[PDB]
Design an enzyme around this catalytic site. Structure first.
Site, short mmCIF file in Angstrom:
data_model
loop_
_atom_site.label_atom_id
_atom_site.label_comp_id
_atom_site.label_asym_id
_atom_site.label_seq_id
_atom_site.Cartn_x
_atom_site.Cartn_y
_atom_site.Cartn_z
N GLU A 11 64.43 15.31 64.48
CA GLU A 11 63.23 15.91 63.91
C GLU A 11 62.62 15.15 62.78
O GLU A 11 61.52 15.43 62.37
CB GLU A 11 63.74 17.20 63.27
CG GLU A 11 64.31 18.12 64.37
CD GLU A 11 63.23 18.67 65.26
OE1 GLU A 11 62.03 18.35 64.86
OE2 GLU A 11 63.43 19.34 66.24
N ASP A 20 53.35 19.39 64.05
CA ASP A 20 54.29 18.98 65.04
C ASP A 20 53.67 18.40 66.28
O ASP A 20 52.47 18.17 66.39
CB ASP A 20 55.43 19.96 65.32
CG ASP A 20 55.12 21.13 66.24
OD1 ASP A 20 53.94 21.17 66.73
OD2 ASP A 20 55.93 21.94 66.53
#
Ligand SMILES: [Cl-]
Ligand SMILES: [Cl-]
Length: 162
Positions: A11, A20
């Protein structure tokens, strides 16, 4: 290698609100803030999660604190889910890390839906499940990350991450 390290690789870490891969407001280590298109909404959620006026920026420790809660939450979600629990219990330590990763990313509901691959994982049919796992939106949208998780399921080692 361990779950925290694995996920930190997948991540990344950002101390400022970002978007994102799906366009959602996120911060820290894959911490989803909101699905709302509004930065304000994102900001308010952030403040609430951290407990201070943050103005969109957090410190490293703060990012780490959200990350610990999130990993804990994912594990517990698995343990409480009637379809996931059996699967997790049947697996070795490395593969347990692979399923926790998917849950952190796509939620319990998301993962619970991979009915067939789940059953395949339970039977220890590695090659077959991996193939099934690849026929998904997940694999098509984040192919590099999905390949890593999928190899982990196939092999039972941390190689994709080494
Ligand atoms: Cl939270
Ligand atoms: Cl990817």
């Amino acid at each position: 290698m361990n779950i925290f390290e694995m996920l930190r690789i997948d991540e990344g870490l950002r101390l400022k609100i970002y978007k994102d891969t799906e366009g959602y407001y996120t911060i820290g280590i894959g911490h989803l803030l909101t699905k709302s298109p509004s930065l304000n909404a994102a900001k308010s959620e952030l403040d609430k999660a951290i407990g201070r006026n943050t103005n969109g920026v957090i410190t490293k420790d703060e990012a780490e604190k959200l990350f610990n809660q999130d990993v804990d939450a994912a594990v517990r979600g698995i343990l409480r889910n009637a379809k996931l629990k059996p699967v997790y219990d049947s697996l070795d330590a490395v593969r347990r890390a692979a399923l926790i990763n998917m849950v952190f990313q796509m939620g319990e509901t998301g993962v619970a839906g991979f009915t067939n691959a789940l059953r395949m994982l339970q039977q220890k049919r590695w090659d077959e499940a991996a193939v099934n796992l690849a026929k998904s939106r997940w694999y098509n949208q984040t192919p590099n990350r999905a390949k890593r998780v999928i190899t982990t399921f196939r092999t039972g080692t941390w190689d994709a991450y080494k």
